[PDB]
């Protein structure tokens, strides 16, 4: 499954609302996860099963979707949350494939 | 049986908002669901349909490419992800359950939610 | 002409009518179809399902396994 | 071969009353129908005709614009809705079936129902 | 298919007889439903297929008609039946559209 | 394009007999068919018609209520289930296929079967 | 709509000219068909609409007429043309009826 | 879907011909099955899809029809075949319903 | 290839009784099974269906919320837990096995049990 | 996996019939157990795997179910059967959890 | 949205050629599609039709039995297998999509492909 | 039906009024469509049902007529309106047939 | 489901164009595969899902079709493509069945 | 990757013969396998299937109750054991590996063995 994201680059300021769209070439049901990789570090899990939240992640991050359209919505962008976000799918009989990554930049 | 939505609020034009619709008291994976607006001063207007699987979908002619509806049968929810909102989209959004029909022509909406108010303004 | 035979015209065209709307009929029955084949689907994927839970199965038999190697 | 009317009663002038007419014992979808009134002291008077599909309707000059005739072939019923009833409409309403004819000119009324009394008074 | 209802607002007293007329721009066969929305709540089905009653609705409500003329008749209006009624059509190859709706007011 | 029938035989009066008709070489689910008798000493005579879907059927005036005609589009078959036979039904039963026509009036019978002999005697 | 075919028996030799007359009690416009049934077989369509020929039949067969008078013309009788010919009408509101049929015999 | 069978009781002798008529209140297409329940036992399937024979069923049994009119014909009644016959419909969107059952008795 | 039930008896109205159905001679985990009543003085009446996994269950409209059908592929056993019994439910309960069909539209009940008698009376 | 037991309190007399219902928030297959804890003692197993009986338990106790609905049926209540009954689930990848427990009292 | 064909070329008379037609930008499994020829010196001519499911096909009278139109909803393609090609069949082939229509009568061909050239010569 | 378009070729300048006449050998009700095919491309739908305008077409194009006489009218010719126009019919029981096509050339 | 292939024998020369056609008695959707069995060996998969190519198979082989009509096309016959080609269907609820196979011989 | 069969030979009718199928060069415990016959003068015929674990197994309707298929994932080996061999069962037996499919609907048989010859004669 070829995984694509949009927009490739997203400019936003502190306190704004940000949505990042992940679109699947094939149906992946609800199996999907969103990561966050700050430069020089290792990516950290944020959302698993495309809707639930990983323990310890701030309640700002939220996600929704099923099938081939997924979104990650940040209700309040903080100075912490300027990093690249990746979209992963692990379907039933499919292997793990990741998106190209959208970078959230200061405006 | 019960059908309660959430996710309302106020957003500026051009932003994106996602609504949710949790179904309780009945088997959700057997019913194709709808979303219906209600703009004050106007009647109800149909928005989108979901075909009991997510396989097939249909939208109103004025919301194609801006509204995406998808359902999660494992958690009994709906999601009408609204993108590129406009001042037109100020309305109350209801969920609807398609009544069982012993035919192939569908039936009316028998179970309606209480609606969430979505306001788009600056 | 109020006076014209309002019956069916039994000698009509009973054929297939090729010019019918061949589209998807967006108003259909989107429901469960309860009378669907409730069986085993013999052609299902008989492979290994690589994307399965690779974890430890925390609820497993913690007993002694009486049939274990009784030698040195 | 049975044709039964219903829906009669007593209403005040200016109100709206609707009638029903069920057909049984024969295929209803293959016959056009008539409604004929019977005012005591007067003979039969034609009211409306339905063209086997609802495609064409014709009314008496005295009830044009106030009477609607429509049929439901799925339930084998007839509907003659009366709007703005007057005192002169006090009569018994019969359903009439047009018999099969091997021409393009129609034929007489074959089967008649027992009729229902509809009266308008103050 | 544009659906209009008349009269837009009618006043009736308790126990009176009420008729609401829904007119379709094009023939909708017998596929039609009548709703009821008390203020601030969600509309509830009353009549489906233009004649049949939804389970739980009192036998007081009745609806009849086919083609392009439809009506909903309340035999004896009750103190609970004062609300706005909407007319919906779902033809075979047409989409779902709702009438403007008539408000039944206490005299 | 071959049309063959079956189910003939000799039966005493008053019994029920079912005929059949097998279609091959053409799309049978697209054509409305007929059943036609050929009584020796007389000409042909129409018996029944099936409207490509089973929605509409029509019969000769002398076999209404005794002969029923139905078709299975999945198996490419016709059935003329005959009840309460008389001696007057001694004839050869054919199948007839209504030819495609570019109008709303139908066409003549283009493809005829071979025929099964049905004899009623004591 | 009762049909009569005359002559009942038409004896002719090979290469002769054959004309068959079909008359209707009531006008059948141009809706009429001609059949051919060799003994022990099923009838085959020859002419439809009283003027057009069925595809695949020889151009030898011909016919014309309107209303209540119809004719079927064979330019040159052939050894396989000896069979019984039937006249069928299918008027707009009238059912399908057939004539008694005429037989062609070797002279 | 209301399903009825006629005649309710069918007297017949050994070697006679038996026909049982099953009528459906709605169009059930070709989805219909015929059963047989001798007293004190459980019903055994005989015909499925209104025409096909279940494996092990004797060739005497046969069925036909479509739409709303179905018949089951026993070409030669045997002393074995004296039992109550039931008619079932399983339409596309309709649930399974059974007929009242006709009882075949010795004459 | 045998299919036998148990668990019947006499219980007072309002009391809960549970039925079982042991399948032998065939692979039980491949078939979706049904429960069917036979009330004396009535024909067979359908009760519930289990969808080969326990994923989907459908009930007759008269037993919804009081009957729970569940299956155990490990022991080749069905269960129909009947709650809040009433005097209506006195009937013989049959198990049914759905035939394999080379389609998606289901098939008839080929294997039937011998029936367990349930009596509800005071 | 949240486990709930109903009814919480069930009054019954000696020789009556008692059914206790255990419902699982998610499908727990056939892995389920029933316990009985008289006041001041330690609970003892009654039913394991949701159907089988522990060695030495009286044959009165019986249970059935699979998936999410489980019930425990006591054929004949005894004067030593008035105790609190608990429902436990041990699914494949789920941990052991218990229900709240119903108390069977003397009527 | 876009609709592009392929598979053209030059083949000898009597050879077999397979054409393809990939659809993108819209739900391809929703529309019944057509193939249309364009012989230079003559206007467009219709060739076949596919009924949104592969269930129903209708061909031109001159290509019945030599052309096979079939569609694959999963990969969003059309196929027109052309057998027993002749010198007459030298024409540009177009794909056509039937417009959505709010009736039972279909609509015109709105979205047309760019066309592929098929040449048959010796 | 055989559709003949007249005139075969008409010359016109920018801003001039152009009328194209399409005729049918049999009545086609209002079931008729018009197409525009620039050289080397695929034809584009302009008018469906002989009166309605397809979405995206300029308001210049218009059409009217019923039965056997149809016309297309361009109020103001434009430099991009010089292309071949075709007349298609889709009757109720007749297949789709196209006209010869008139070419509009620059004067 | 019975699968038959035509022609059963297909003579062709080096560099020619070859088409082998497989027909299914019932709709098999897109589930179909083509094999190649040189004599004395075991058949090797060439095409799966009726359109794709198995990895390593040369680009000459291609397949098309859906429903009940299928076709395997070789754009250029090679010296080692002279073998028996088979047809298989694996539908939803249908078991795997093979056609009788066609043999390609030198000309 | 290599897959070779063994264990064939000549036996009298009514006797029992067992085949083995050693798989090498790939992860055998991940693939569902088949057995396929090739009778001379006939096409390939399917015989049995094993579901990657021994959990599920289906047979051709002509070999049910006489053939047993089972696999030994530790040794990378299949086994089809024949009981009551008949004269019909003379053919060449191939093992077939089910292709990996990124869906729930299986795939075709890619890797086939060299097959072994089984002869039943007296």
């Amino acid at each position: 499954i070829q995984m694509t994201q949009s927009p490739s680059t997203l400019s936003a300021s502190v306190g704004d609302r940000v949505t990042i769209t992940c679109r699947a070439s094939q149906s992946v049901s609800t199996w999907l996860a969103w990561y966050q990789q700050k430069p020089g570090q290792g990516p950290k899990l944020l959302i698993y099963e495309a809707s639930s939240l990983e323990s310890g992640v701030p309640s700002r991050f939220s996600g929704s979707g099923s099938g081939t359209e997924f979104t990650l919505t940040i209700s309040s962008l903080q100075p912490d949350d300027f990093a690249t976000y990746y979209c992963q799918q692990y379907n039933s009989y499919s292997f793990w494939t990741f998106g190209q990554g959208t970078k959230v930049e200061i405006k | 049986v019960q059908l309660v939505e959430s996710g309302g609020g106020v957003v500026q034009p051009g932003r994106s908002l996602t609504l949710s619709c949790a179904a309780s008291g009945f088997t959700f994976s057997n019913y194709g669901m709808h979303w219906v607006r209600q703009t004050p001063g106007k009647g109800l207007a149909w928005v989108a349909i979901i075909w009991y699987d997510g396989s097939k979908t249909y939208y109103e002619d004025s919301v194609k490419g801006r509204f995406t509806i998808s359902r999660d049968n494992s958690k009994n929810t709906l999601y009408l992800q609204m993108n590129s909102l406009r001042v037109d989209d100020t309305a109350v959004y209801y969920c609807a359950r398609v009544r069982h029909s012993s035919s192939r022509h569908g039936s009316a909406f028998d179970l309606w939610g209480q609606g969430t108010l979505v306001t788009v303004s600056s | 002409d109020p006076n014209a035979n309002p019956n069916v015209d039994p000698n009509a065209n009973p054929n297939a009518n090729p010019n019918a709307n061949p589209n998807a009929n967006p108003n259909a029955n989107p429901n469960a179809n309860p009378n669907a084949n409730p069986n085993a689907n013999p052609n299902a994927n008989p492979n290994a399902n690589p994307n399965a839970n690779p974890n430890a199965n925390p609820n497993a038999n913690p007993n002694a396994n009486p049939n274990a190697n009784p030698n040195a």
Side-chain angles (χ1 to χ4, degrees), chain B residues 61-85:
Chain B
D61 312 308
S62 83
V63 304
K64 322 189 51 61
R66 326 187 306 102
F67 282 16
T68 302
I69 173 175
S70 60
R71 73 188 292 166
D72 192 345
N73 291 21
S74 72
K75 298 192 288 293
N76 300 337
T77 55
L78 279 165
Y79 303 105
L80 176 88
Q81 311 152 20
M82 315 136 58
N83 299 310
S84 313
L85 283 191

Short mmCIF file of all heavy atoms in Angstrom, two decimals, chain B residues 61-85:
data_model
loop_
_atom_site.label_atom_id
_atom_site.label_comp_id
_atom_site.label_asym_id
_atom_site.label_seq_id
_atom_site.Cartn_x
_atom_site.Cartn_y
_atom_site.Cartn_z
N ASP B 61 -24.32 17.79 -3.91
CA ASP B 61 -23.56 18.36 -5.01
C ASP B 61 -22.68 19.53 -4.58
O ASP B 61 -21.70 19.83 -5.26
CB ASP B 61 -24.50 18.79 -6.12
CG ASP B 61 -25.51 17.72 -6.49
OD1 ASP B 61 -25.09 16.57 -6.75
OD2 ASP B 61 -26.72 18.01 -6.51
N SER B 62 -23.00 20.18 -3.47
CA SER B 62 -22.26 21.36 -3.03
C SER B 62 -21.19 21.05 -2.00
O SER B 62 -20.54 21.98 -1.51
CB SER B 62 -23.22 22.40 -2.45
OG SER B 62 -23.51 22.11 -1.10
N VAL B 63 -20.98 19.79 -1.64
CA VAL B 63 -20.00 19.45 -0.62
C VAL B 63 -19.04 18.39 -1.13
O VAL B 63 -18.29 17.79 -0.35
CB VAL B 63 -20.67 18.98 0.67
CG1 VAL B 63 -21.63 20.03 1.17
CG2 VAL B 63 -21.39 17.69 0.43
N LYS B 64 -19.05 18.12 -2.43
CA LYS B 64 -18.13 17.14 -2.98
C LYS B 64 -16.71 17.67 -2.92
O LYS B 64 -16.42 18.76 -3.41
CB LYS B 64 -18.51 16.79 -4.41
CG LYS B 64 -20.00 16.73 -4.66
CD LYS B 64 -20.31 16.18 -6.03
CE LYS B 64 -19.57 14.88 -6.27
NZ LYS B 64 -19.96 13.82 -5.31
N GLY B 65 -15.82 16.88 -2.33
CA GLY B 65 -14.42 17.25 -2.22
C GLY B 65 -14.06 18.07 -1.00
O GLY B 65 -12.87 18.31 -0.77
N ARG B 66 -15.04 18.50 -0.22
CA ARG B 66 -14.78 19.21 1.02
C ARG B 66 -15.21 18.44 2.25
O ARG B 66 -14.66 18.67 3.33
CB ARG B 66 -15.49 20.57 1.03
CG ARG B 66 -15.58 21.23 -0.33
CD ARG B 66 -16.13 22.64 -0.23
NE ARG B 66 -17.40 22.70 0.47
CZ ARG B 66 -17.54 23.10 1.72
NH1 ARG B 66 -16.50 23.45 2.45
NH2 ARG B 66 -18.76 23.15 2.26
N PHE B 67 -16.17 17.54 2.13
CA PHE B 67 -16.65 16.73 3.23
C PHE B 67 -16.31 15.28 2.94
O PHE B 67 -16.54 14.79 1.84
CB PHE B 67 -18.16 16.88 3.40
CG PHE B 67 -18.58 18.14 4.09
CD1 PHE B 67 -17.71 19.20 4.23
CD2 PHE B 67 -19.85 18.26 4.61
CE1 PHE B 67 -18.09 20.35 4.86
CE2 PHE B 67 -20.23 19.41 5.25
CZ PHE B 67 -19.36 20.45 5.37
N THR B 68 -15.75 14.59 3.93
CA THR B 68 -15.43 13.18 3.79
C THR B 68 -16.03 12.43 4.97
O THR B 68 -15.69 12.71 6.12
CB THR B 68 -13.92 12.95 3.74
OG1 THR B 68 -13.37 13.68 2.64
CG2 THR B 68 -13.63 11.48 3.56
N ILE B 69 -16.92 11.49 4.68
CA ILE B 69 -17.59 10.71 5.71
C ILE B 69 -17.01 9.31 5.73
O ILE B 69 -16.83 8.70 4.67
CB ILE B 69 -19.11 10.68 5.48
CG1 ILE B 69 -19.78 9.73 6.46
CG2 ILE B 69 -19.42 10.26 4.09
CD1 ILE B 69 -21.26 9.74 6.35
N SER B 70 -16.71 8.81 6.92
CA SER B 70 -16.20 7.46 7.06
C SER B 70 -16.61 6.94 8.42
O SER B 70 -16.77 7.71 9.37
CB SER B 70 -14.69 7.41 6.89
OG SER B 70 -14.05 8.21 7.86
N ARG B 71 -16.78 5.63 8.51
CA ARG B 71 -17.33 5.02 9.71
C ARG B 71 -16.36 3.98 10.25
O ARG B 71 -15.57 3.40 9.51
CB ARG B 71 -18.67 4.36 9.44
CG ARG B 71 -18.58 3.09 8.65
CD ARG B 71 -19.95 2.60 8.26
NE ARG B 71 -20.72 2.16 9.41
CZ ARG B 71 -22.03 1.95 9.39
NH1 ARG B 71 -22.73 2.10 8.29
NH2 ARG B 71 -22.63 1.56 10.50
N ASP B 72 -16.42 3.77 11.56
CA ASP B 72 -15.57 2.82 12.27
C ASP B 72 -16.49 1.84 13.00
O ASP B 72 -16.92 2.09 14.12
CB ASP B 72 -14.65 3.55 13.23
CG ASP B 72 -13.56 2.67 13.77
OD1 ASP B 72 -13.67 1.43 13.64
OD2 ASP B 72 -12.58 3.21 14.33
N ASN B 73 -16.76 0.70 12.35
CA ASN B 73 -17.72 -0.26 12.90
C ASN B 73 -17.25 -0.89 14.20
O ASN B 73 -18.08 -1.39 14.96
CB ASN B 73 -17.99 -1.36 11.88
CG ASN B 73 -18.77 -0.86 10.69
OD1 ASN B 73 -18.78 0.34 10.41
ND2 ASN B 73 -19.41 -1.77 9.98
N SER B 74 -15.94 -0.90 14.46
CA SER B 74 -15.44 -1.54 15.67
C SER B 74 -15.77 -0.74 16.92
O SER B 74 -15.90 -1.31 18.01
CB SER B 74 -13.94 -1.77 15.57
OG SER B 74 -13.25 -0.54 15.68
N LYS B 75 -15.90 0.58 16.79
CA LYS B 75 -16.19 1.45 17.92
C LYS B 75 -17.56 2.11 17.84
O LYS B 75 -17.90 2.91 18.71
CB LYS B 75 -15.11 2.52 18.05
CG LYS B 75 -13.74 1.97 18.31
CD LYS B 75 -12.78 3.06 18.72
CE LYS B 75 -12.44 3.95 17.55
NZ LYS B 75 -11.66 3.21 16.53
N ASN B 76 -18.35 1.79 16.81
CA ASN B 76 -19.68 2.36 16.64
C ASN B 76 -19.63 3.89 16.58
O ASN B 76 -20.15 4.59 17.45
CB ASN B 76 -20.63 1.88 17.75
CG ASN B 76 -20.78 0.38 17.78
OD1 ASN B 76 -20.57 -0.29 16.77
ND2 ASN B 76 -21.18 -0.14 18.92
N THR B 77 -18.97 4.39 15.54
CA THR B 77 -18.85 5.83 15.34
C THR B 77 -19.02 6.18 13.87
O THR B 77 -18.90 5.33 12.99
CB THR B 77 -17.50 6.36 15.83
OG1 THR B 77 -16.45 5.63 15.19
CG2 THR B 77 -17.37 6.22 17.33
N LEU B 78 -19.32 7.46 13.62
CA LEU B 78 -19.23 8.07 12.31
C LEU B 78 -18.25 9.23 12.36
O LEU B 78 -17.97 9.78 13.43
CB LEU B 78 -20.58 8.60 11.83
CG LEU B 78 -21.57 7.63 11.21
CD1 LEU B 78 -22.92 8.30 11.16
CD2 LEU B 78 -21.13 7.27 9.83
N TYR B 79 -17.74 9.62 11.20
CA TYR B 79 -16.82 10.74 11.13
C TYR B 79 -17.08 11.50 9.84
O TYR B 79 -16.80 10.98 8.76
CB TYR B 79 -15.37 10.27 11.18
CG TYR B 79 -15.01 9.46 12.39
CD1 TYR B 79 -14.85 8.09 12.30
CD2 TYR B 79 -14.82 10.06 13.62
CE1 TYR B 79 -14.51 7.34 13.40
CE2 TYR B 79 -14.48 9.32 14.72
CZ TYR B 79 -14.33 7.96 14.61
OH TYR B 79 -14.00 7.22 15.71
N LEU B 80 -17.61 12.71 9.95
CA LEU B 80 -17.78 13.57 8.78
C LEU B 80 -16.70 14.65 8.86
O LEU B 80 -16.90 15.70 9.45
CB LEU B 80 -19.17 14.18 8.74
CG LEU B 80 -19.45 15.18 7.62
CD1 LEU B 80 -19.94 14.48 6.39
CD2 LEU B 80 -20.46 16.21 8.06
N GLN B 81 -15.56 14.37 8.25
CA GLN B 81 -14.42 15.28 8.32
C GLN B 81 -14.66 16.42 7.35
O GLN B 81 -14.66 16.22 6.13
CB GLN B 81 -13.13 14.54 8.00
CG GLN B 81 -12.96 13.24 8.77
CD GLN B 81 -12.14 12.22 8.02
OE1 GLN B 81 -11.38 12.56 7.12
NE2 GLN B 81 -12.29 10.95 8.39
N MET B 82 -14.88 17.61 7.87
CA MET B 82 -15.22 18.78 7.07
C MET B 82 -13.96 19.59 6.81
O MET B 82 -13.29 20.02 7.75
CB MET B 82 -16.28 19.62 7.77
CG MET B 82 -17.42 18.80 8.34
SD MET B 82 -17.92 19.28 10.00
CE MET B 82 -18.33 20.99 9.72
N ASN B 83 -13.65 19.82 5.54
CA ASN B 83 -12.50 20.61 5.14
C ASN B 83 -12.95 21.82 4.34
O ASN B 83 -13.98 21.79 3.66
CB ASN B 83 -11.52 19.79 4.29
CG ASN B 83 -10.98 18.61 5.03
OD1 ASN B 83 -10.50 18.73 6.15
ND2 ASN B 83 -11.04 17.44 4.40
N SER B 84 -12.17 22.90 4.43
CA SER B 84 -12.44 24.13 3.69
C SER B 84 -13.83 24.66 4.01
O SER B 84 -14.65 24.90 3.13
CB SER B 84 -12.28 23.91 2.19
OG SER B 84 -11.08 23.22 1.90
N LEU B 85 -14.10 24.85 5.30
CA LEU B 85 -15.40 25.33 5.74
C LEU B 85 -15.63 26.76 5.26
O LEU B 85 -14.70 27.54 5.08
CB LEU B 85 -15.51 25.26 7.26
CG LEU B 85 -15.75 23.87 7.82
CD1 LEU B 85 -16.10 23.97 9.28
CD2 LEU B 85 -16.85 23.19 7.06
#
